Amino acid sequence: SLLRRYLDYPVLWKILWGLVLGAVFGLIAGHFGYAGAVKTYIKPFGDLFVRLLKMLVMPIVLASLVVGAASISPARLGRVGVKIVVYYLATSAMAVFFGLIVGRLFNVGANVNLGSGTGKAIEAQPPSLVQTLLNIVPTNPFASLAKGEVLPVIFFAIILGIAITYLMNRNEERVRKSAETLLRVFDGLAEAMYLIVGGVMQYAPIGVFALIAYVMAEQGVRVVGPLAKVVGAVYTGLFLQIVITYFILLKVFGIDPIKFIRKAKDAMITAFVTRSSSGTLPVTMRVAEEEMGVDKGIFSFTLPLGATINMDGTALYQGVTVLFVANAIGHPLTLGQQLVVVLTAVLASIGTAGVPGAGAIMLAMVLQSVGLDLTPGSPVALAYAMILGIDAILDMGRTMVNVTGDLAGTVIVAKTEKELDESKWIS
Amino acid sequence: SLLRRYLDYPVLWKILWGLVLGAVFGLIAGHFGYAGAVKTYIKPFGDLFVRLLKMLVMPIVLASLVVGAASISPARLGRVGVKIVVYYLATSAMAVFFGLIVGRLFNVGANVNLGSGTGKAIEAQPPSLVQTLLNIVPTNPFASLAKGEVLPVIFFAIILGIAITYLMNRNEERVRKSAETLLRVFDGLAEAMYLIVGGVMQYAPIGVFALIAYVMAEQGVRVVGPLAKVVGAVYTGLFLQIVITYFILLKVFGIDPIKFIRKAKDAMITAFVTRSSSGTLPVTMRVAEEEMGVDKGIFSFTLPLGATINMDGTALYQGVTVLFVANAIGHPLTLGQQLVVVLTAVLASIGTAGVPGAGAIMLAMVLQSVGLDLTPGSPVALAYAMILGIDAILDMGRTMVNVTGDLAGTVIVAKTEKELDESKWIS
Amino acid sequence: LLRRYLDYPVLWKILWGLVLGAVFGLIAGHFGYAGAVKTYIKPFGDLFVRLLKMLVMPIVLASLVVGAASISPARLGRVGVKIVVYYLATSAMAVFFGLIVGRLFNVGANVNLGSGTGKAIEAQPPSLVQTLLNIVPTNPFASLAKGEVLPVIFFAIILGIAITYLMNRNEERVRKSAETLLRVFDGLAEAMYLIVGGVMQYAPIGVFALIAYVMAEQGVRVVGPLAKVVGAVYTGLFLQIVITYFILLKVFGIDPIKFIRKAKDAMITAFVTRSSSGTLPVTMRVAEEEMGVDKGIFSFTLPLGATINMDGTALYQGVTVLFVANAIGHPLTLGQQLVVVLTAVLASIGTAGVPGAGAIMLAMVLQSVGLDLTPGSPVALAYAMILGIDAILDMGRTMVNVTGDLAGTVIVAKTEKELDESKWIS
Ligand SMILES: N[C@@H](CC(=O)O)C(=O)O
């Protein structure tokens, strides 16, 4: 059938085709003179998609974060455990930092010009940095769920997950079963949200097509050029991410980085082509075993984690594309909420979906966190539509660096613990 | 036994007693000089009742909708399943349409002097129709739970129910277990709220008596006339719905409706007398099997379901008694809300208990859905009290189409696949 | 330091942090950098206060649903009525003690803030009927998302009762569903207690900062017409600990000096952390293994009394309203002081168990008279002189908010004979 074939095409290439068809439809609707004809009939689908996607930020944040932070914690993390979780969070932070640096350096979204004048958010007195830190702990977690605050809910969710996993070890049975049932509730909620995200991203082709037809018909923006600069900035950012972060870490931890790249090439290409991080886990394991020298005790637990919480390419994408959305609507980010992006792109990666749409939802999450809202109609929705349309071209490098990150963390861990076979690094 | 005889007197027949006693007490203490004293001493009980009745709407709507959606989702509906569920939803929508039609024909609440002269004219300028349909989708489900928006919560709850059952049909045992646990959480919450609704409806005679005593002894408004109009508008609505909707909907399927009613009379009058749509399930099943000729597999699946999600009588009762409120208080309904009422009534009939007093919780929910809040002390509360008072005269009759629309759709679906042996519908 | 600061017992590592904070605030706010503790140190105190406020709504929703769902309604009614009568009696007696000590010390005596006649003579807004109605929430989620503890307490109790009715049903489906919902709420309460036990490990630094900022800014500003209120309020608290509670226990055959000797831990855990709903685990570990109260009694009367039983906030909301009305230039009326028995109790019931929640609700208990800030009425002078001295009054008046919880739980558990009388024998 037609609708049954529409749900079979690869969802990200469907979204990219939606963006392209939306751009051409808008150019035509300008070439003909039917601006209102698409602003009244084609826009409602765009607003429907924007709302249908912005609905899925708070439930995912809460449930996914609770489950993810209950999966890793000082309770069930041993010696390899904390030494790899510290590494994952540190390298995700450096990845978001490289994202923001390379965004400002490529001047992302500086020449799209779809804002609403130098205003509509005028404050002239931003909050201090220490206050921006204290605002992470919420005075009332339910009021921080209702008011749509993302970072306080992330903090409370992580704390609740750690507390539950502390409970699961207690010597009583009532507390153990209570903690198990609470974690199962949050697991069910997070996975139901992943199904609904699958459905919303199935719809997303039409949503992006509408939000691009409306913007290309109503006014004239630059969506053929700044998207090229975002692709260039993302890929140069991932290149720099590797050849700086992982190279300085390997050099400072005794490993020879040229050898690491020459051996990790197999998992890198496999994830680049296959385009999936959790689907290239066997090949990553095979490379870490037969090529690096990591023992089974270190990479039978690190890689199944580094394929779930070490999202470096996704973090750098959430850096540079947040910066594109911010410079696009004309509200550049200050050095006080350029760190909120880091915090809620590192913590929000501690629990991440594997479904197609784990970058877009997290980008909407970082947008709602840093202070830009996705209300239907605001140019934030239009710039997010352009980024979501380009998504299918960034996913490849995203997953390549995603699987190079944990493959470079396993080698470091197994070397620091003297459980790395030195015989597989020389001759 | 000082309370037990009161608590055991059949509710909905102590509510009508509360209404009549309130009317007569407001009469005898209205032209005796005690209006201030009845507002200071008696009306606080009606205030407490209105607060206790608003306390239930959000938890009951969220939990009941989630469980009902997960009960009739497309993940478990077969062929007869969809063929009967699209019927159960279309007939409820047409039933509320007939309710609005017949409630604007009789001018249900036109001769009631609630509210004030005009109040304010700025209350106009509603959002467009398509903007309402987009406002069905919530930007934040927790923010729609807090702000008391009962239609977006309905949508999110239906979505979450369908997601939870699509989970329960998954292969991974961990996620199936998590989905079962989440569904049992929502089931337990819905059942606890049904218990609380039972308690509140046990208290409701005092609340209706107090509100009626206050409104009578204060403004001596019409309570006999307009209630004799709404009881009669609802009954003409029911009669018209049977004789029009079910007759055309049986005749367009080759089923002669005359003999349909002639052989459904037994179940009809049994549900009319017993005032229970669930307590007439044995008679409904025997009359669908023997006297009508429907195969076993169909009426063993559509009657136990239709007695819970197909309420074409309370749908029409809400469609008429929300016109009653919106015409008595002095805020006539706009076409942008004569559709919110339909969607809310239809999607709220999807999960209902049948507990005596759950046809008025749906009315409170529909009121909170169109905009008319039950603000305590405001004319919406007094009009809703006058409606809830006459909940026996309406119940005896609207418990009959509730189960006529069950064996009127079972026969349709049995005919649509040749399980309805025409040896019974001949001569 | 490795695992050292995390394995020193919490009581005398919060008390030590408080002592170090007092001495540091003094020697650094009297001698050298007195404005650096506002930039570098006070933010840690703010982090601690926000962490304490984070754990009030879930700890009063879940720990009340699983509290009221563990008592059969037959005993729940009796315990609830007994404990509500007790809380209200102690509150209406604490306000009276506050009034008599505020008229005894003559608080706000040598302050003439420039008022001619003073508008504090007709201050009778409240009705108590709309107040008894506001207990019932019109929306439970909207009363959770707004930090209202009384409506959510009502809903949590009426939900625990519904659950303990459901677990006696014939349908095994609804039986299992109610048990699963009860397990969710029990797990939420237990996780909240673990989070509180983890926050009390940061509590040394938080108390250090919160008291360093005060003992640096108000190191010398507790002399003059202000010391008297700190000398009155505290005396008030002393009387409340010594006259009311003791006598109450002396009526029910419960040794008072032993009661204090046993509640020492909860007293010094609420006096330094300033929150009566963040010392709830330390109060439960005192009522169960040192007092001898059956779990069904305290598991409900402690999460309830942690918020609605404040016999110190009331005794503080009497002396301080009397002070802010005496600094205007006219004492409190003999008949107007009786509404303080009703407006400082109805404000000591909705007030949340968080630090510095007495000075905030003091604005509401002053809205009974409702004066404006700058001109003609020094209600933001004789209340800016109090908010600056709050974190000292907000330490003793939250020691009695948990001694009241413990005394009421001991009374209710001894009247119902569910108290283990093998503990008070020595
Ligand atoms: N912090 C106090 C409340 C207050 O003083 O306002 C307590 O809960 O004990």
C-alpha to C-alpha distances, A390 to A16, A220, A400, nearest whole angstrom:
6, 19, 17
Q: Hey, what's the torsion of the CAs at C235, C238, C240, C245, to 10 degrees?
A: -170
Residues followed by a break in chain A, C–N over 2.5 Å?
none
C-alpha to C-alpha distances, B124 to B119, B332, B336, nearest whole angstrom:
12, 10, 11
Phi then psi for A369, rounded to 5 degrees?
Answer: -75, -55
Alpha carbon distance A20, A224 (integer Å): 10
Q: Report the atom number in ligand 1 closest to the C-alpha of C398.
A: 9
Alpha carbon distance A304, A403 (integer Å): 11
How close is the Cα of C354 to the center of ligand 1, in Å? 5
C-alpha to C-alpha distances, A98 to A88, A110, A329, nearest whole angstrom:
15, 18, 22
Residue of C138, C162, C184 lying closest to B55 (CB–CB): C138
Alpha carbon distance C229, B29 (integer Å): 53
Alpha carbon distance A255, A354 (integer Å): 31
CB contact under 8 A, C136 and B196: no
Residues of A in contact with C54 (CB under 8 A): 137-141, 156
How close is the Cα of C397 to the center of ligand 1, in Å? 7
**Burial of residue C110, with CB atoms counted within 10 A of its CB: 0-12 exposed, 13-18 middle, 19 or more buried:** exposed
**Burial of residue A5, with CB atoms counted within 10 A of its CB: 0-12 exposed, 13-18 middle, 19 or more buried:** exposed
Of C385, C242, C390, the closest CA to residue C317 belongs to C390
Experimental method: cryo-EM
Look up residue C256 and give its two tokens.
Answer: 């008072």
C300: closest CA of chain B, how far (Å): 20
Q: How many residues does chain A have?
A: 427
Alpha carbon distance A360, A366 (integer Å): 10
Residues of A in contact with C190 (CB under 8 A): 167, 175, 178-179
CB contact under 8 A, C54 and A140: yes
Which residue do the tokens 């005028």 mark?
A: A122
Alpha carbon distance B336, A76 (integer Å): 55
Alpha helices in A55-113 (DSSP H): 58-71, 79-106
Residue of A nearest to C61 (CA): A142
Look up residue A127 and give its two tokens.
Answer: 């909050």
The DSSP symbol for C371 reads: -
CB contact under 8 A, C162 and B192: yes
Alpha carbon distance C205, C402 (integer Å): 23
Of A387, A355, A271, the closest CA to residue A10 belongs to A355
Kindly list the domain boundaries of chain A, sorted by start residue. 1-427
Residue of C138, C144, C177 lying closest to B187 (CB–CB): C177
Look up residue A175 and give its two tokens.
Answer: 């507390």
Residue of C146, C163, C176 lying closest to B184 (CB–CB): C176
B156: closest CA of chain A, how far (Å): 9
Which residue do the tokens 């260039």 mark?
A: A232
- Angle (CA) A242-A244-A245 rounded to 5° is 70
How close is the Cα of B126 to the center of ligand 1, in Å? 46
CB contact under 8 A, C181 and B196: no
Alpha carbon distance A288, A265 (integer Å): 11
**Contact call for residues A216 and A25 (beta carbons, < 8 A):** yes
Residues of B in contact with C174 (CB under 8 A): 187-188, 191
Alpha carbon distance B324, B226 (integer Å): 9
How close is the Cα of B411 to the center of ligand 1, in Å? 66
Of C220, C203, C206, the closest CA to residue C26 belongs to C220
CATH code of the region C1-426: 1.10.3860.10
CB contact under 8 A, B47 and C163: no
Residues 6+ apart with CB under 8 A from C360: none
Task: Tell me which of B54, B189, B202, B378 to substitute to probe the interface with C (most C C-beta atoms closer than 10 Å).
Answer: B189
C338: closest CA of chain A, how far (Å): 34
| Plot region of A308 (φ>0 → left; ψ -120 to 50 → alpha; else → beta) | alpha
Alpha carbon distance B14, B205 (integer Å): 6
Which residue do the tokens 């809830």 mark?
A: B388
Alpha carbon distance B227, B321 (integer Å): 10
Touching A: B residues 232-291, CB under 8 Å: none
Alpha carbon distance C133, C362 (integer Å): 22
**Contact call for residues A366 and A344 (beta carbons, < 8 A):** yes
Which residue do the tokens 């309460």 mark?
A: C189
Q: Does A153 touch chain C (CB under 8 A)?
A: no
CB contact under 8 A, A58 and B142: yes
Task: Tell me which of B56, B140, B184, B186 to substitute to probe the interface with C (most C C-beta atoms closer than 10 Å).
Answer: B184
| Plot region of A254 (φ>0 → left; ψ -120 to 50 → alpha; else → beta) | left
| Plot region of A216 (φ>0 → left; ψ -120 to 50 → alpha; else → beta) | alpha
Amino acid at C162: A
C-alpha to C-alpha distances, A258 to A98, A119, A424, A426, C370, nearest whole angstrom:
21, 50, 13, 12, 75
Q: Report the atom number in ligand 1 closest to the C-alpha of C277.
A: 8
Amino acid at C58: P
Alpha carbon distance A40, A33 (integer Å): 14
Q: Report the atom number in ligand 1 closest to the C-alpha of C397.
A: 5
Q: Does B31 touch chain C (CB under 8 A)?
A: no
Q: Which of C362, C390, C398, C403 to mutate to test the pocket of ligand 1 (most atoms within 8 A of CB)?
A: C398
Alpha carbon distance C369, C377 (integer Å): 11
CB contact under 8 A, B164 and A192: yes
Across the B:C interface, residue pairs with CB atoms under 8 Å apart total: 78
Look up residue C280 and give its two tokens.
Answer: 């709830």
How close is the Cα of C106 to the center of ligand 1, in Å? 24
CB contact under 8 A, C58 and A182: no
Residues of C in contact with A159 (CB under 8 A): 195
**Burial of residue C414, with CB atoms counted within 10 A of its CB: 0-12 exposed, 13-18 middle, 19 or more buried:** buried
Residues 6+ apart with CB under 8 A from A135: A127, A151, A152
Residues 6+ apart with CB under 8 A from B9: none
Q: Hey, what's the torsion of the CAs at A383, A386, A389, A393, to 10 degrees?
A: -110
Of the candidate CATH numbers 1.10.3860.10, 3.40.470.10, 3.40.50.1170, 1.10.287.1080, the domain formed by B1-427 belongs to 1.10.3860.10
What do you get for the CA distance between the two ends of chain B, in Å?
A: 58
Other CB atoms within a 10 A radius of the CB of residue A422 amount to: 10
Residue of C nearest to A147 (CA): C145
Residues of C in contact with B146 (CB under 8 A): 139, 141-142, 144-146
Alpha carbon distance A292, A414 (integer Å): 10
How close is the Cα of B139 to the center of ligand 1, in Å? 36
Q: Report the atom number in ligand 1 closest to the C-alpha of C313.
A: 5
**Contact call for residues A215 and A388 (beta carbons, < 8 A):** no
**Contact call for residues B66 and B186 (beta carbons, < 8 A):** yes
| Plot region of B363 (φ>0 → left; ψ -120 to 50 → alpha; else → beta) | alpha
Question: What residues line ligand 1, using a CB cutoff of 6 Å?
Answer: C 274-277, 310, 313, 351, 353-355, 357-358, 394, 397-398, 401
Alpha carbon distance B75, B338 (integer Å): 31
Q: What is the DSSP string of A252-320?
A: HTT--HHHHHHHTHHHHHHHHHH--STTSHHHHHHHIIIII-B-HHHHTTSHHHHTTT--HHHHHHHHH
Q: Which of C351, C361, C400 to mutate to test the pocket of ligand 1 (most atoms within 8 A of CB)?
A: C351
